[PDB]
Design a binder for this molecule. Structure first.
Ligand SMILES: [Mg+2]
Ligand SMILES: [Zn+2]
Ligand SMILES: [Zn+2]
Lengths: 470, 1166
């Protein structure tokens, strides 16, 4: 059943999925539009989503940000941007004061203008995240207040949802429902200090966000549903189109990456293709997806397929260098000289050699050499970074020699010479430093040092040290 | 006292499964990128397989960025890019890790033959793999609904079952599944339940598997390993320098294959994290998880799935498993070999001038080898200012350095070794003698030990460095300290060829020669008579000699007399030291006699006199052989005059039988046998003609007309002395050679009539060629078989070492002369020699103890036993030794290159294996494969069967493929009934009584049977006698000892019958077991002591069990051993040879036995 070799358990697993009809593509894409627009509208119905954008533009003109980090532009320059944002702020400052039944008609239009803005994906993500996190904030108090009644103070949930729905803020449910003389009613008193105090952040939500706990759920719930529809449809599309990825990736086989690696990178490319596709331009999804998949494949190959990573332009350069070789090889009768393709190429032309070197892939250290025996290439690589013991002994002896010779000079000259150099001490010392230490400073030291050298210069002293210089 | 925290000198080692947190403990950073180096500036890209931050600085004590370059700043972590500046060596040490996205199976525990994840979960392998590949769903903690815990479901099935039960049911798939299974698993509860189930149901099938599995589980619990660790959350990365990118000539780079693999792993991992963050469809992320699994598997152990190939190169890439395993079968770099400093080698030459304690060492070689000593000795005397100047001097080869070299050489031994090292004598220590030349000079008497010809064989030299090595080489490996083969007490220093032709030519006698009949005062004027040309080397003469006998008490008696001897014998006598009687030199002095001279000298005078004796023997043998003028001409090989006539008559016989086949009186095959027989008889006749003519034909006159003696012809003297040549080869020279045989083995009926002295024609030569090629092939093959055999032997023995002094058991085997079928195929004296007596022995009359309980029987004791008629002696052996985990020296015997009792701590297993192995080249069901069969205890092809129990037997039932045999013991119950196939002809009498172990059929019998139905002494006796039959039929001398220690190693394990401590049927150490029942017989339970049954394990099988896992990982399949040990959390205490060899410390034997013992007692103590 399963031969293993994961190429197969993939090839067979995807091969179940049926190819889409030309109409099915448009059905699915329409579904995509439905989902997304649902989340967009759900974003437009959030007051904080508006106010935040406003504050952010107040920061943009204050030079604390840039127009590129807020909008990707609207449907449609800084002046046009300024006036569009002016329009937005206008609808906001009207809708805000009209909260005194009729206001809805404007709160709808307030969404519309807010929908004119095409947000940077990052900003959009920040908004959505803010919404769902705020819903975490709501769920915190919902579950706190629920557990403090049901789990701790022993109340049934069936009677717990009765005064909940429609209110879940004011004192109608907390203070007026404990007098009901139910078996669970008098038990609500022990926890009353904990429920009423944590009810502060609850009602607070209807202040910051500007929505009763009722709406806060409905809106981003609708959002959740929309996102679901979106991801569902897009996934469906990609799953339908994997075969294309495979068929393309078969071209890129031996470039130095594995088959499944190829088709996976290409799969990612197909995902991006679904994410950026618009069916309204009439362009066939096939030939549109092809470029993207081929792009992901080639880009990835260029990037990760070597032990030594090389920049893209360099790779392409090498390739051109290969083309020239292919043409001029039989044309020149043997092969073009190493400097031949050089002038054929635009750049400084000695670069060939340099490039021609760095292009080469490193030879496997396990590459077997003669006898077929355990002799392998890496066995013969010698450590050149090791210091030979023959020298190590001399490094050990030089210390004794220079120590004895440094026992020779006057105790102060010895200190000055051991100081001017790193002898038996940390780092080494500037002559000014030596001066400040010794209290007898500047030119002085430089003189003593000289004479010190002079004492060790002519041989009695010199016969021991001179033997060291080879 | 505070015990310690940081570095000590460690003991044992431990191996187990690795926690993710542990893998993190090792890891000094997470390598997040496939990048290696920057591509222009070759600096490591930060957090990549090669990295400065995670692993270490590129150059010594230098930050990567270049800020802190000073040897002062050290513990500093650079602010720019954190790198603690420290030696580049730490890039050879520091590990790393990678946090994988999805869990991953560790391919070793999935694919090891007894799949660990599989049998821990009682889950079949193919199912688990089907789960890992996302080919099906598996349940975990099914609760009570419809479903088994380990049950597997398909897509639709999982859907349906899920629709039925939302919760209180759980199923996963992929790696996360298996990991969840392992984590959820409660071993203890399974233990309880399995104990119960073991108890309730009675079936063999049920409780066998039941007990095996419960034992497995509880072992795994006791380990400290938690099952989850078989699934890798984190993957450790190996230090960069152990998989280096280092540059080459031409600016090219070369790197280990582990980089490709690690790279792939990191790539697919990161891409998986990406695919998770992109909310990819299942079919994609699944493929990615699988690919990651494959990449990781390929990294750890490649080849158990797809065998991935390296970039642009077809050849599969070497994985970490392949890194550990190595190649050339099982070789771990302490095994196949290791390169060594202070060494050399070259072509070898003779050097007869040498004393036996020295060897010629080429000048230049000595200079280069001893170069560091020379440097130190040069500046110690002050001839060189500093070490640099010393180098300059020895490089200049200044005149003064040679004397200094003569200084450092004097008392400093060197080790000499040859190519096929078999027995310990393959390496011998010598005192170096400076020689002008490029060739190594090696003492002639040693040539036998090395099996070294002079045809261009090479020898390798090794300089013992440390003081302990010098003294080891001098007191152990020294040439003079081994004069005797460890296999048998006979001298290996026996004179070889030229020398024995010399001593043979010297003492021999012709009929009439110069100085015949005269008389001389002593050997002095005998030699003086010879050198002056007055008297001939060989002439019958009476001379006065003074011999000695030490036969007083420690004292040499003197006696003088007129001996009838020759001139040559008289001259030679000057050499023979002290207490030896003149009787020894008064013979013809053949190789055997010339050897026994040495042997007696050693068993009388001691070591030193024997050494110098052998030396003088060599010198005089060479000198006099040279004087002798021995040579070989074409006329030295004498063909029988009657040859052609024999040929003709024997050729008449063939035409007789041919005429009969023409007339049809005889059948073709019968004819074939007839003709072959007449030709064979012919060859025998010609051989026994040329032998008489060659041997006795000297016909020479003393004072009369004629007398005849043994020939002085060169080739005869050579063949007779034992120098070189033999009756067969000489027969091939003069007489006709043999009858050949086609590769089939059908012997050709037209033999080679011509010999080598005559010409062979075309056909004859062509036919000889096959014999030649098959000869070379077979010999070159038997070398390999020998090596393999010795290998199995030391593998099965090794760690066996003399440990205790005397176990003090009366136990031992009855030693009789071998007495086979004829007269005495081997005496009693050889079998009992050097062996300790188990108990006192008797004269024919008694209360007279000749040999008193346990005493080494040396030559004098054995001769005292020989004076008396004693046919029987009970002797302590290594197989019967009461001591556990080793042999007591008192049991072993004396045998060694020294005649004294075996030392405490010498490793006997090795020398036994070697002693059995070395002659193995000289062995021809029978043969070396027969030897192998014996040591492997293989049940033969057509074995006999022995009576299970004594008492009257009869036949029962019928013809089902077995006609049953019913045995009837006298007092006891009958029911033993064995099924004997009746198509095999029986022996046992239907109406007669048969003792247990009698012949119920014919053919060889499996030693398992001999062990069970006869018993331990009987089985060890069978093995030793049969293998010794094989060797002795070839003329190979091997003491019974070595074979007996191998035998002891064979029977090391046994299966229990009764109970009261451990499990019922377990095969286990009889050391452990016996020490447990000896301990159980008192204290403890009053006696609960269990009964076992001795088992026989073949040598290749017995080698499998070794306490130390490091040892097992050497010669066994490494991959399996490491896993199997890791699951049990096995803790290797070393304690053996091989393990300590691998880990690189002192061997727990020999010189090191004082160390390891002193440490052994410190362990498990205060
Ligand atoms: Mg040879
Ligand atoms: Zn730095
Ligand atoms: Zn013993």
């Amino acid at each position: 059943g399963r031969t293993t070799d994961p190429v197969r358990m993939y090839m067979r697993e995807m091969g179940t999925v049926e190819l889409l009809t030309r109409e099915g593509e448009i059905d699915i894409a329409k579904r995509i539009e439905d989902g997304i627009n649902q989340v967009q509208c759900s974003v437009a119905e959030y007051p904080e989503a508006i106010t935040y954008l406003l504050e952010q533009y107040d920061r943009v003109e204050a030079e604390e940000a840039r127009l590129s980090d807020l909008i990707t532009g609207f449907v449609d320059d800084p002046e046009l941007a300024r006036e569009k944002f002016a329009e937005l702020r206008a609808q906001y400052v009207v809708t805000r004061d009209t909260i005194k039944a009729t206001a809805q008609e404007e709160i709808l239009k307030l969404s519309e203008v807010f929908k004119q803005f095409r947000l940077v994906p990052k900003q959009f993500d920040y908004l959505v995240n803010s919404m769902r996190v705020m819903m975490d904030r709501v769920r915190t108090q919902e579950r706190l207040i629920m557990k403090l009644c049901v789990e701790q103070c022993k109340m049934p949930k069936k009677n717990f949802i009765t005064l909940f729905t429609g209110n879940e803020t004011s004192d109608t449910w907390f203070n007026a429902a404990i007098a009901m003389n139910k078996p669970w009613s008098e038990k609500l008193h022990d926890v009353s200090e904990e429920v009423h105090r944590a009810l502060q952040k609850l009602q607070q939500i209807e202040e910051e966000t500007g929505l009763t706990i009722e709406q806060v759920k409905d809106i981003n719930r609708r959002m959740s549903i929309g996102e679901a529809k979106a991801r569902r449809a897009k996934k469906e599309m990609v799953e339908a189109n994997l075969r294309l990825v495979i068929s393309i990736a078969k071209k890129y086989t031996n470039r130095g990456l594995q088959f499944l690696d190829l088709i996976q990178e290409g799969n990612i490319g197909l995902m991006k293709a679904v994410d950026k596709f618009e069916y309204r331009r009439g362009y066939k999804f096939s030939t549109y997806a092809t470029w993207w998949i081929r792009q992901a494949i080639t880009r990835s190959i260029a990037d990760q397929a070597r032990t030594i990573r090389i920049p893209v332009h360099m790779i392409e350069t090498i390739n051109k260098l290969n083309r020239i070789s292919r043409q001029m090889l039989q044309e020149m009768g043997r092969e073009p000289t190493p400097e031949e393709l050089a002038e054929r190429m635009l750049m400084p032309e000695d670069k060939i050699r340099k490039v021609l070197k760095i292009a080469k892939e490193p030879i496997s250290m396990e590459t077997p050499i003669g006898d077929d025996e355990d002799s392998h290439l890496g066995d013969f690589i010698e450590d050149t970074t090791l210091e030979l013991p023959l020298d190590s002994a001399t490094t050990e002896s030089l210390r004794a020699a220079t120590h004895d010779v440094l026992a020779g000079l006057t105790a102060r000259e010895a200190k000055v010479l051991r100081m001017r150099f790193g002898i038996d001490m940390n780092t080494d010392y500037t002559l000014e430093e030596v001066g400040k230490q010794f209290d007898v400073t500047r030119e002085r030291i430089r003189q003593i040092e000289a004479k010190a050298l002079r004492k060790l210069r002519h041989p009695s002293r010199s016969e021991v040290l001179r033997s060291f210089l080879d | 006292l505070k015990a310690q925290t940081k570095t000590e000198e460690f003991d044992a080692i431990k191996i187990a499964l690795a926690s993710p947190d542990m893998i993190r403990s090792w890891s000094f950073g997470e390598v997040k990128k496939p990048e290696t180096i920057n591509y222009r500036t070759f600096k490591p890209e930060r957090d990549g397989l090669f990295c400065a931050r995670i692993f270490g600085p590129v150059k010594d004590y230098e930050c990567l960025c270049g800020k802190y370059k000073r040897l002062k700043h050290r513990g500093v972590i650079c602010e720019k890019c954190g790198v603690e500046v420290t030696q580049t060596k730490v890039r050879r040490e520091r590990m790393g890790h990678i946090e994988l996205a999805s869990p991953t199976a560790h391919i070793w525990f999935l694919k090891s033959l007894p799949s660990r994840i599989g049998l821990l979960l009682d889950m079949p392998l193919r199912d688990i793999e089907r789960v890992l590949y996302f080919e099906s769903y598996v349940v975990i903690e099914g609760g009570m609904t419809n479903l088994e815990r380990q049950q597997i479901l398909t897509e639709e099935q999982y859907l349906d079952a899920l629709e039925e039960f939302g919760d209180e049911f759980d199923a996963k798939m992929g790696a996360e599944a298996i990991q969840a299974l392992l984590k959820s698993m409660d071993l203890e509860q399974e233990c309880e339940q399995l104990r119960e189930e073991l108890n309730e149901t009675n079936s063999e099938t049920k409780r066998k598997k039941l007990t095996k599995r419960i034992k497995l589980l509880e072992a795994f619990v006791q380990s400290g390993n938690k099952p989850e660790w078989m699934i890798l959350t984190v993957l450790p990365v190996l230090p960069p320098d152990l998989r280096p990118l280092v540059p080459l000539d031409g600016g090219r780079f070369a790197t280990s294959d582990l980089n490709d693999l690690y790279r792939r792993v990191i790539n697919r991992n990161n891409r998986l994290k990406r695919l998770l963050d992109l909310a990819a469809p299942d079919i994609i992320v699944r493929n990615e998880k699988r690919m990651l699994q494959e990449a990781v598997d390929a990294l750890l152990d490649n080849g158990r799935r797809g065998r991935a190939i390296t970039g642009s190169n077809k050849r599969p890439l070497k994985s970490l498993a392949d890194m550990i395993k190595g190649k050339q079968g099982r070789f771990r770099q302490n095994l196949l070999g290791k390169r060594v400093d202070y060494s050399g080698r070259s072509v070898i030459t003779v050097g007869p001038y040498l004393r036996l304690h020295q060897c010629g060492l080429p000048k230049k070689m000595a200079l280069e080898l001893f170069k560091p000593f020379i440097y130190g000795k040069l500046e110690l005397r002050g001839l060189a200012t500093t070490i640099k100047a010393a180098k300059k001097m020895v490089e200049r080869e200044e005149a003064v350095v040679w004397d200094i070299l003569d200084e450092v050489i004097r008392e400093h031994p060197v080790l000499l070794n040859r190519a096929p090292t078999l027995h310990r004598l393959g390496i011998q220590a010598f005192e170096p003698v400076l020689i002008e030349g490029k060739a190594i000079q090696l003492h002639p008497l040693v040539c036998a030990a090395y099996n070294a010809d002079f045809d261009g064989d090479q020898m390798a030299v090794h300089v013992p460095l440390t003081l302990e090595a010098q003294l080891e080489a001098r007191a152990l490996m020294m040439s003079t300290n081994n004069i005797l083969s460890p296999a048998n007490g006979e001298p290996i220093i026996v004179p070889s060829q030229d020398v024995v032709l010399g001593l043979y030519y010297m003492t021999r006698d012709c009929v009439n020669a110069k100085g015949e009949g005269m008389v001389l005062t002593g050997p002095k004027e005998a030699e003086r008579l010879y050198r002056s040309g007055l008297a001939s080397l060989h002439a019958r003469v009476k001379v006065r000699i003074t011999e000695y006998e030490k036969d007083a008490n420690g004292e040499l008696v003197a006696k003088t007399s007129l001996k009838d001897t020759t001139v040559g014998r008289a001259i030679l006598w000057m050499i023979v030291p002290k207490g030896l009687p003149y009787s020894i030199v008064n013979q013809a002095l053949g190789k055997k006699a010339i050897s026994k001279m040495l042997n007696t000298c050693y068993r009388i005078l001691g070591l030193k006199p024997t050494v110098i004796f052998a030396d003088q023997i060599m010198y005089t043998g060479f000198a006099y052989a040279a004087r002798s003028g021995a040579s070989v001409g074409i006329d030295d090989m004498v063909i029988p005059e009657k040859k052609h006539e024999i040929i003709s008559e024997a050729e008449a016989e063939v035409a007789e039988i041919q005429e009969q086949f023409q007339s049809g009186l005889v059948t073709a095959g019968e004819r074939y046998n007839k003709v072959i027989d007449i030709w064979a008889a012919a060859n025998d006749r010609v051989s026994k003609a040329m032998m008489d003519n060659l041997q006795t034909e000297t016909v020479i006159n003393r004072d009369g007309q004629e007398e005849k003696q043994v020939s002085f012809n060169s080739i005869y003297m050579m063949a007779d002395s034992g120098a070189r040549g033999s009756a067969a080869q000489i027969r091939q020279l003069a007489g006709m050679r043999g009858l050949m045989a086609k590769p089939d083995g059908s012997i050709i009926e037209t033999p080679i009539t011509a010999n080598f002295r005559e010409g062979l024609n075309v056909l004859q030569y062509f036919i000889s060629t096959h014999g030649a090629r098959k000869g070379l092939a077979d010999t070159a093959l038997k070398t390999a078989n020998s090596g393999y055999l010795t290998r199995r032997l030391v593998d099965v023995a090794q760690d066996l070492v003399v440990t205790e002094d005397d176990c003090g058991t009366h136990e031992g085997i009855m030693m009789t002369p071998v007495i086979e079928g004829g007269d005495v195929k081997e005496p009693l004296r050889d079998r009992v020699l050097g062996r300790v007596t188990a108990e006192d022995v008797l004269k024919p009359g008694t209360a007279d103890i000749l040999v008193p309980r346990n005493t080494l029987l040396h030559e004098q004791w054995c001769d005292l036993l020989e004076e008396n008629s004693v046919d029987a002696v009970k002797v302590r052996s290594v197989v019967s030794c009461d001591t556990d985990f080793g042999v007591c020296a008192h049991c072993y015997g004396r045998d060694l290159a020294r005649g004294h009792i075996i030392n405490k701590g010498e490793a006997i297993g090795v020398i036994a294996a070697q002693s059995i192995g070395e002659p193995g080249t000289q062995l021809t069901t029978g043969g070396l494969p027969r030897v192998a069969d014996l040591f492997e205890a293989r049940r033969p092809k057509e074995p006999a069967i022995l009576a299970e129990i004594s008492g009257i037997v009869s036949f029962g039932k019928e013809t089902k493929g077995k006609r049953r045999l019913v045995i009837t013991p006298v007092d006891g119950s009958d029911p033993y009934e064995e099924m004997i196939p009746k198509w095999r002809q029986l022996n046992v009498f239907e109406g007669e009584r048969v003792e247990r172990g009698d012949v119920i059929s014919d053919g060889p019998e499996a030693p398992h049977d001999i062990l069970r139905l006869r018993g331990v002494h009987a089985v060890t006796r069978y093995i030793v006698n049969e293998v010794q039959d094989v060797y002795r039929l070839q003329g190979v001398k091997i003491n019974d000892k070595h074979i007996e220690v191998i035998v002891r190693q064979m029977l090391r394990k046994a299966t229990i019958v009764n109970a009261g401590s451990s499990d019922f049927l377990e095969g286990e150490q009889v050391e452990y077991s016996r020490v447990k029942i000896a301990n159980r017989e008192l204290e403890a339970n009053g006696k609960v002591g269990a009964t076992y049954s001795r088992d026989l394990l073949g040598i290749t099988k017995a080698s499998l069990a070794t306490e130390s896992f490091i040892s097992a990982a050497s010669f066994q399949e490494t991959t399996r051993v490491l896993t199997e040990a890791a699951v049990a959390g096995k803790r290797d205490e070393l304690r053996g040879l091989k393990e300590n060899v691998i880990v690189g410390r002192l061997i727990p034997a020999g010189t090191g036995y004082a160390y390891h013992q002193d440490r052994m007692r410190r362990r498990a103590a205060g």
